[PDB]
PDB file of C-alpha atoms in Angstrom:
ATOM      1  CA  UNK A   1     156.313 -71.950 -38.486  1.00 41.42           C
ATOM      2  CA  UNK A   2     158.972 -72.808 -41.077  1.00 41.73           C
ATOM      3  CA  UNK A   3     161.399 -69.957 -39.527  1.00 39.30           C
ATOM      4  CA  UNK A   4     160.833 -71.661 -36.741  1.00 41.38           C
ATOM      5  CA  UNK A   5     161.327 -75.579 -38.360  1.00 38.99           C
ATOM      6  CA  UNK A   6     164.697 -74.937 -38.158  1.00 39.88           C
ATOM      7  CA  UNK A   7     164.714 -78.371 -35.916  1.00 40.34           C
ATOM      8  CA  UNK A   8     164.066 -81.843 -37.223  1.00 42.03           C
ATOM      9  CA  UNK A   9     165.085 -80.292 -40.711  1.00 40.33           C
ATOM     10  CA  UNK A  10     163.873 -81.117 -44.555  1.00 38.69           C
ATOM     11  CA  UNK A  11     164.574 -84.866 -44.083  1.00 40.28           C
ATOM     12  CA  UNK A  12     161.753 -87.457 -42.992  1.00 37.11           C
ATOM     13  CA  UNK A  13     164.276 -89.779 -42.104  1.00 39.02           C
ATOM     14  CA  UNK A  14     168.150 -89.655 -40.430  1.00 41.51           C
ATOM     15  CA  UNK A  15     168.256 -86.065 -39.084  1.00 41.83           C
ATOM     16  CA  UNK A  16     166.147 -84.707 -36.123  1.00 37.52           C
ATOM     17  CA  UNK A  17     167.399 -82.854 -33.219  1.00 39.19           C
ATOM     18  CA  UNK A  18     166.510 -82.570 -29.402  1.00 39.03           C
ATOM     19  CA  UNK A  19     168.083 -81.535 -26.486  1.00 36.08           C
ATOM     20  CA  UNK A  20     169.021 -83.418 -23.762  1.00 38.27           C
ATOM     21  CA  UNK A  21     169.191 -80.231 -21.092  1.00 35.69           C
ATOM     22  CA  UNK A  22     169.674 -76.514 -21.145  1.00 35.66           C
ATOM     23  CA  UNK A  23     171.081 -73.887 -19.803  1.00 35.26           C
ATOM     24  CA  UNK A  24     170.433 -69.519 -18.953  1.00 35.82           C
ATOM     25  CA  UNK A  25     172.860 -66.971 -18.106  1.00 36.34           C
ATOM     26  CA  UNK A  26     172.319 -63.179 -19.368  1.00 40.26           C
ATOM     27  CA  UNK A  27     173.735 -59.605 -18.951  1.00 39.05           C
ATOM     28  CA  UNK A  28     171.993 -56.626 -17.144  1.00 37.57           C
ATOM     29  CA  UNK A  29     172.163 -53.424 -18.576  1.00 40.00           C
ATOM     30  CA  UNK A  30     174.267 -51.497 -15.977  1.00 39.90           C
ATOM     31  CA  UNK A  31     172.882 -48.661 -13.721  1.00 41.81           C
ATOM     32  CA  UNK A  32     172.944 -44.614 -14.874  1.00 40.71           C
ATOM     33  CA  UNK A  33     174.964 -42.359 -13.610  1.00 40.84           C
ATOM     34  CA  UNK A  34     174.556 -38.957 -16.320  1.00 45.48           C
ATOM     35  CA  UNK A  35     176.316 -35.448 -14.907  1.00 48.81           C
ATOM     36  CA  UNK A  36     173.225 -33.607 -15.510  1.00 48.14           C
ATOM     37  CA  UNK A  37     170.703 -35.534 -13.857  1.00 47.28           C
ATOM     38  CA  UNK A  38     172.717 -36.210 -10.613  1.00 44.47           C
ATOM     39  CA  UNK A  39     172.226 -33.610  -8.215  1.00 45.28           C
ATOM     40  CA  UNK A  40     176.155 -33.060  -7.869  1.00 45.70           C
ATOM     41  CA  UNK A  41     175.661 -31.273 -11.197  1.00 49.01           C
ATOM     42  CA  UNK A  42     174.260 -27.839  -8.936  1.00 50.05           C
ATOM     43  CA  UNK A  43     177.589 -26.962  -8.447  1.00 46.71           C
ATOM     44  CA  UNK A  44     179.107 -27.090 -11.505  1.00 46.20           C
ATOM     45  CA  UNK A  45     178.434 -24.407 -14.975  1.00 46.03           C
ATOM     46  CA  UNK A  46     179.421 -26.409 -18.251  1.00 45.29           C
ATOM     47  CA  UNK A  47     180.685 -24.967 -20.636  1.00 48.35           C
ATOM     48  CA  UNK A  48     181.059 -26.447 -23.742  1.00 47.66           C
ATOM     49  CA  UNK A  49     184.672 -25.980 -25.425  1.00 48.07           C
ATOM     50  CA  UNK A  50     186.489 -27.475 -28.627  1.00 47.38           C
ATOM     51  CA  UNK A  51     190.043 -26.941 -28.279  1.00 48.26           C
ATOM     52  CA  UNK A  52     191.221 -26.900 -24.004  1.00 51.77           C
ATOM     53  CA  UNK A  53     195.201 -28.140 -25.382  1.00 51.14           C
ATOM     54  CA  UNK A  54     194.610 -25.999 -28.129  1.00 49.49           C
ATOM     55  CA  UNK A  55     194.472 -22.375 -26.839  1.00 49.68           C
ATOM     56  CA  UNK A  56     195.615 -21.180 -22.852  1.00 48.18           C
ATOM     57  CA  UNK A  57     192.905 -19.676 -20.104  1.00 47.94           C
ATOM     58  CA  UNK A  58     194.124 -17.491 -17.703  1.00 48.23           C
ATOM     59  CA  UNK A  59     193.076 -14.234 -16.267  1.00 44.84           C
ATOM     60  CA  UNK A  60     189.100 -15.448 -15.682  1.00 43.66           C
ATOM     61  CA  UNK A  61     188.486 -11.884 -14.131  1.00 42.40           C
ATOM     62  CA  UNK A  62     185.749 -10.984 -12.589  1.00 40.85           C
ATOM     63  CA  UNK A  63     183.861  -7.436 -12.386  1.00 38.85           C
ATOM     64  CA  UNK A  64     181.680  -6.652  -9.679  1.00 38.88           C
ATOM     65  CA  UNK A  65     179.780  -3.804  -8.592  1.00 38.43           C
ATOM     66  CA  UNK A  66     179.551  -3.423  -4.814  1.00 39.54           C
TER      67      UNK A  66
ATOM     68  CA  UNK B   1     154.647 -72.234 -28.164  1.00 36.02           C
ATOM     69  CA  UNK B   2     158.061 -73.275 -27.031  1.00 33.94           C
ATOM     70  CA  UNK B   3     159.971 -76.513 -26.177  1.00 30.17           C
ATOM     71  CA  UNK B   4     156.882 -78.403 -25.535  1.00 29.32           C
ATOM     72  CA  UNK B   5     156.441 -78.539 -29.361  1.00 28.85           C
ATOM     73  CA  UNK B   6     159.535 -80.086 -30.322  1.00 29.50           C
ATOM     74  CA  UNK B   7     159.499 -82.597 -27.119  1.00 29.94           C
ATOM     75  CA  UNK B   8     155.957 -83.311 -28.244  1.00 29.90           C
ATOM     76  CA  UNK B   9     157.201 -83.667 -32.135  1.00 32.57           C
ATOM     77  CA  UNK B  10     160.743 -85.817 -30.615  1.00 36.93           C
ATOM     78  CA  UNK B  11     158.402 -87.960 -28.573  1.00 36.01           C
ATOM     79  CA  UNK B  12     156.497 -88.667 -31.299  1.00 33.93           C
ATOM     80  CA  UNK B  13     159.643 -90.069 -33.205  1.00 29.05           C
ATOM     81  CA  UNK B  14     161.273 -91.509 -30.319  1.00 29.65           C
ATOM     82  CA  UNK B  15     158.063 -94.281 -30.204  1.00 31.58           C
ATOM     83  CA  UNK B  16     157.701 -94.251 -34.022  1.00 30.32           C
ATOM     84  CA  UNK B  17     161.454 -95.179 -34.708  1.00 29.94           C
ATOM     85  CA  UNK B  18     161.527 -97.491 -31.283  1.00 28.68           C
ATOM     86  CA  UNK B  19     158.642 -99.706 -33.246  1.00 31.25           C
ATOM     87  CA  UNK B  20     160.631 -99.556 -36.186  1.00 31.41           C
ATOM     88  CA  UNK B  21     164.004-101.211 -34.838  1.00 34.10           C
ATOM     89  CA  UNK B  22     162.004-103.606 -33.247  1.00 31.36           C
ATOM     90  CA  UNK B  23     160.187-104.613 -36.096  1.00 36.24           C
ATOM     91  CA  UNK B  24     163.652-105.206 -37.681  1.00 35.70           C
ATOM     92  CA  UNK B  25     164.828-107.309 -34.913  1.00 38.15           C
ATOM     93  CA  UNK B  26     161.478-109.552 -35.240  1.00 44.20           C
ATOM     94  CA  UNK B  27     163.063-110.350 -38.974  1.00 40.84           C
ATOM     95  CA  UNK B  28     166.377-111.001 -37.723  1.00 39.13           C
ATOM     96  CA  UNK B  29     165.025-113.300 -34.970  1.00 37.21           C
ATOM     97  CA  UNK B  30     163.386-115.011 -37.489  1.00 37.76           C
ATOM     98  CA  UNK B  31     166.611-115.358 -39.310  1.00 37.78           C
ATOM     99  CA  UNK B  32     168.131-116.339 -35.913  1.00 38.67           C
ATOM    100  CA  UNK B  33     165.724-119.316 -35.166  1.00 38.39           C
ATOM    101  CA  UNK B  34     165.551-120.926 -39.009  1.00 36.33           C
ATOM    102  CA  UNK B  35     169.513-120.663 -38.512  1.00 36.22           C
ATOM    103  CA  UNK B  36     168.887-122.794 -35.658  1.00 34.05           C
ATOM    104  CA  UNK B  37     166.977-124.740 -36.138  1.00 35.42           C
ATOM    105  CA  UNK B  38     168.860-125.916 -39.467  1.00 37.68           C
ATOM    106  CA  UNK B  39     172.269-126.179 -37.277  1.00 35.34           C
ATOM    107  CA  UNK B  40     169.837-128.742 -35.153  1.00 35.10           C
ATOM    108  CA  UNK B  41     168.657-130.191 -37.452  1.00 36.38           C
ATOM    109  CA  UNK B  42     171.863-130.903 -39.701  1.00 34.35           C
ATOM    110  CA  UNK B  43     174.068-133.766 -39.127  1.00 32.96           C
ATOM    111  CA  UNK B  44     177.991-133.489 -41.169  1.00 33.09           C
ATOM    112  CA  UNK B  45     179.013-134.166 -43.343  1.00 31.10           C
ATOM    113  CA  UNK B  46     181.093-136.911 -43.095  1.00 30.81           C
ATOM    114  CA  UNK B  47     178.398-139.332 -41.231  1.00 32.71           C
ATOM    115  CA  UNK B  48     176.144-137.972 -43.851  1.00 32.25           C
TER     116      UNK B  48
ATOM    117  CA  UNK C   1     167.316 -70.667 -21.689  1.00 28.51           C
ATOM    118  CA  UNK C   2     170.037 -72.220 -24.426  1.00 28.48           C
ATOM    119  CA  UNK C   3     169.639 -75.662 -25.101  1.00 27.44           C
ATOM    120  CA  UNK C   4     172.504 -78.251 -24.843  1.00 26.99           C
ATOM    121  CA  UNK C   5     171.519 -79.970 -28.398  1.00 26.03           C
ATOM    122  CA  UNK C   6     172.178 -83.371 -29.352  1.00 25.77           C
ATOM    123  CA  UNK C   7     171.219 -85.235 -32.781  1.00 29.03           C
ATOM    124  CA  UNK C   8     169.402 -88.889 -33.548  1.00 29.37           C
ATOM    125  CA  UNK C   9     171.155 -90.981 -36.766  1.00 28.99           C
ATOM    126  CA  UNK C  10     167.401 -92.655 -37.908  1.00 32.43           C
ATOM    127  CA  UNK C  11     169.750 -95.246 -40.480  1.00 29.03           C
ATOM    128  CA  UNK C  12     168.312 -98.832 -39.591  1.00 30.64           C
ATOM    129  CA  UNK C  13     169.455-100.922 -42.866  1.00 31.04           C
ATOM    130  CA  UNK C  14     165.936-102.681 -43.579  1.00 29.90           C
ATOM    131  CA  UNK C  15     166.167-107.280 -43.796  1.00 28.79           C
ATOM    132  CA  UNK C  16     163.394-108.442 -46.021  1.00 27.49           C
ATOM    133  CA  UNK C  17     162.898-112.560 -44.864  1.00 30.19           C
ATOM    134  CA  UNK C  18     162.921-113.082 -48.886  1.00 28.16           C
ATOM    135  CA  UNK C  19     165.911-110.821 -50.279  1.00 27.15           C
ATOM    136  CA  UNK C  20     168.192-112.777 -48.087  1.00 24.69           C
ATOM    137  CA  UNK C  21     168.462-116.217 -50.190  1.00 22.27           C
ATOM    138  CA  UNK C  22     167.805-118.507 -46.514  1.00 24.02           C
ATOM    139  CA  UNK C  23     164.033-118.098 -47.914  1.00 23.07           C
ATOM    140  CA  UNK C  24     164.733-120.494 -50.267  1.00 23.29           C
ATOM    141  CA  UNK C  25     165.532-122.980 -47.546  1.00 23.69           C
ATOM    142  CA  UNK C  26     162.269-121.641 -46.013  1.00 26.86           C
ATOM    143  CA  UNK C  27     158.701-121.434 -46.766  1.00 26.42           C
ATOM    144  CA  UNK C  28     157.325-119.020 -44.470  1.00 29.17           C
ATOM    145  CA  UNK C  29     153.012-119.351 -44.233  1.00 31.02           C
ATOM    146  CA  UNK C  30     151.175-117.023 -41.099  1.00 33.81           C
ATOM    147  CA  UNK C  31     148.485-117.836 -39.704  1.00 34.17           C
ATOM    148  CA  UNK C  32     147.313-116.126 -36.469  1.00 35.66           C
ATOM    149  CA  UNK C  33     146.546-119.110 -33.900  1.00 35.55           C
ATOM    150  CA  UNK C  34     149.778-120.779 -34.014  1.00 36.78           C
ATOM    151  CA  UNK C  35     150.269-118.880 -30.302  1.00 39.01           C
ATOM    152  CA  UNK C  36     147.217-122.097 -29.455  1.00 36.04           C
ATOM    153  CA  UNK C  37     148.975-124.641 -31.605  1.00 33.71           C
ATOM    154  CA  UNK C  38     149.614-127.651 -29.437  1.00 35.70           C
ATOM    155  CA  UNK C  39     151.505-130.268 -31.675  1.00 38.72           C
ATOM    156  CA  UNK C  40     151.516-129.830 -35.370  1.00 37.79           C
ATOM    157  CA  UNK C  41     152.289-133.013 -37.838  1.00 37.34           C
ATOM    158  CA  UNK C  42     152.181-134.263 -41.190  1.00 35.23           C
ATOM    159  CA  UNK C  43     151.570-137.845 -41.486  1.00 33.00           C
ATOM    160  CA  UNK C  44     153.730-140.339 -44.227  1.00 33.68           C
ATOM    161  CA  UNK C  45     152.400-143.373 -46.088  1.00 30.56           C
ATOM    162  CA  UNK C  46     155.228-144.874 -47.764  1.00 33.70           C
ATOM    163  CA  UNK C  47     155.422-147.873 -49.404  1.00 34.34           C
ATOM    164  CA  UNK C  48     157.885-150.139 -50.846  1.00 35.36           C
TER     165      UNK C  48
END
């Protein structure tokens, strides 16, 4: 399995590697919070926009029939 | 599998290597015991 | 699990007995029952 045969090399003598001990710690993928997945996003309407800094939005006024 | 192959191969190499080292030590023991016997046998040059 | 690797060296130099010049003093013959030999002796017949 010569891709796996890094160990003991290409020489019959004077070159073989082993190991005394081993050790292992991994790292996790942390948890998953998407906005539209989480149930706070019902209270919000989300509008994609390109430049909030560049044009100023005020007087958003709503016309209401009664 | 994983690690067990390499521990197997290194155990085989440990046995073969220690046998080779012991054979070399037997040869040097032959050297040393023959030299020991010559030093037991040889009287010094002024006596001879 | 990652391993703490070590490396062996296997070069132990090889001494043949008949290569070294102690063997011109020596004369070595195998005999597989020297463990069973109690006393070996040679007998010399000198006449003047």
